[PDB]
Amino acid sequence: MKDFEKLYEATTKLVSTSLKVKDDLKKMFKQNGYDITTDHYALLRFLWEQDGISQIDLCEKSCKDKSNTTRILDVMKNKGLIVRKVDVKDRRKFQIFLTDLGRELEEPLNEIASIYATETFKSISDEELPLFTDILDRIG
Amino acid sequence: PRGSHMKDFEKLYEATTKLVSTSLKVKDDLKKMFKQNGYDITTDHYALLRFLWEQDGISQIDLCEKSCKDKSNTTRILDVMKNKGLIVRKVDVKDRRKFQIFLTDLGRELEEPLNEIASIYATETFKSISDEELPLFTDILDRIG
Ligand SMILES: O=C(O)c1ccccc1O
Ligand SMILES: O=C(O)c1ccccc1O
Numbered sequence: 528m529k530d531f532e533k534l535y536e537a538t539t540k541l542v543s544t545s546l547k548v549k550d551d552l553k554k555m556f557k558q559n560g561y562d563i564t565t566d567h568y569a570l571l572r573f574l575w576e577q578d579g580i581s582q583i584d585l586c587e588k589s590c591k592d593k594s595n596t597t598r599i600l601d602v603m604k605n606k607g608l609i610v611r612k613v614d615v616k617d618r619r620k621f622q623i624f625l626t627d628l629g630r631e632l633e634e635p636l637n638e639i640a641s642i643y644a645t646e647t648f649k650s651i652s653d654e655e656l657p658l659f660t661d662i663l664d665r666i667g
Numbered sequence: 668p669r670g671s672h673m674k675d676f677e678k679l680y681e682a683t684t685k686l687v688s689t690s691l692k693v694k695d696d697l698k699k700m701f702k703q704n705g706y707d708i709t710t711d712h713y714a715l716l717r718f719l720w721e722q723d724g725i726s727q728i729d730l731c732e733k734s735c736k737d738k739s740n741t742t743r744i745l746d747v748m749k750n751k752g753l754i755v756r757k758v759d760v761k762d763r764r765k766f767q768i769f770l771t772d773l774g775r776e777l778e779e780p781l782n783e784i785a786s787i788y789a790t791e792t793f794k795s796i797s798d799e800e801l802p803l804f805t806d807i808l809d810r811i812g
Binding site: 544 | 668672678679682717735790793795798812
């Protein structure tokens with residue numbers, strides 16, 4: 528039926544497809560001169576939707592945890608993509624803002640990611656997307 | 668690139684996210700599965716042993732290709748697996764540079780009790796997914812890329 532061999536394959540494919548996809552996309556960013564990771568692009572996506580999100584919300588949005596998200600954010604700050612501000616209401620609590628460089632990169636990075644998305648999913652039909660997704664949702 | 672039937676980018680992005688967040692939630696779930704249960708063994712240790720139990724005495728080339736992955740990391744974990752006393756290297760009787768990987772005694776004894784655990788975790792992991800869905804999932808994932 529769905530014996531251990533298949534479940535182990537499934538799990539294995541899921542993890543490796545995920546890794547390949549992150550890594551191919553990062554390579555395509557680098558090929559075009561953008562030295563960013565997939566993690567940076569995801570976080571930037573949140574920020575292009577809503578500037579000045581608190582650190583705290585952003586770690587909840589992240590699909591990652593606080594220690595890993597915070598490290599990733601330091602790198603981005605170091606790359607000049609965002610700044611960190613002492614809050615207008617509080618202290619020990621920051622807001623995360625786009626720099627101009629961070630805003631400038633919406634168009635170009637989203638374009639590269641589109642190109643990468645269309646090719647990577649060319650063999651999949653539109654209608655398979657919610658099936659795939661609803662399976663992933665019910666795993667674990 | 669293009670076509671007369673394009674998918675919406677946002678949908679592909681959301682699905683890519685779901686793929687990735689789910690892979691992570693799954694690795695998290697499985698992190699301590701041997702350790703909480705009395706075997707000081709990682710996930711990576713385990714996935715390599717699966718290849719070894721299937722093909723004991725495989726070439727470190729074919730293994731690094733089996734693993735897909737980064738050779739130093741594949742190799743680096745191999746190293747802990749030597750140190751823990753799970754595997755060792757004998758040198759391939761073809762070249763003087765090509766290696767071969769072989770399970771230690773623990774390595775072979777560990778098959779049953781570690782597969783037993785992983786089976787029970789896998790079953791749990793996929794318990795709300797149906798029999799027909801499994802090869803569908805799997806076929807989608809193969810076609811991605
Ligand atoms: O990747 C693993 O080590 C694993 C563990 C338990 C069940 C399925 C799996 O692929
Ligand atoms: O969840 C992620 O880190 C991610 C990975 C690849 C593409 C888009 C993403 O949001």
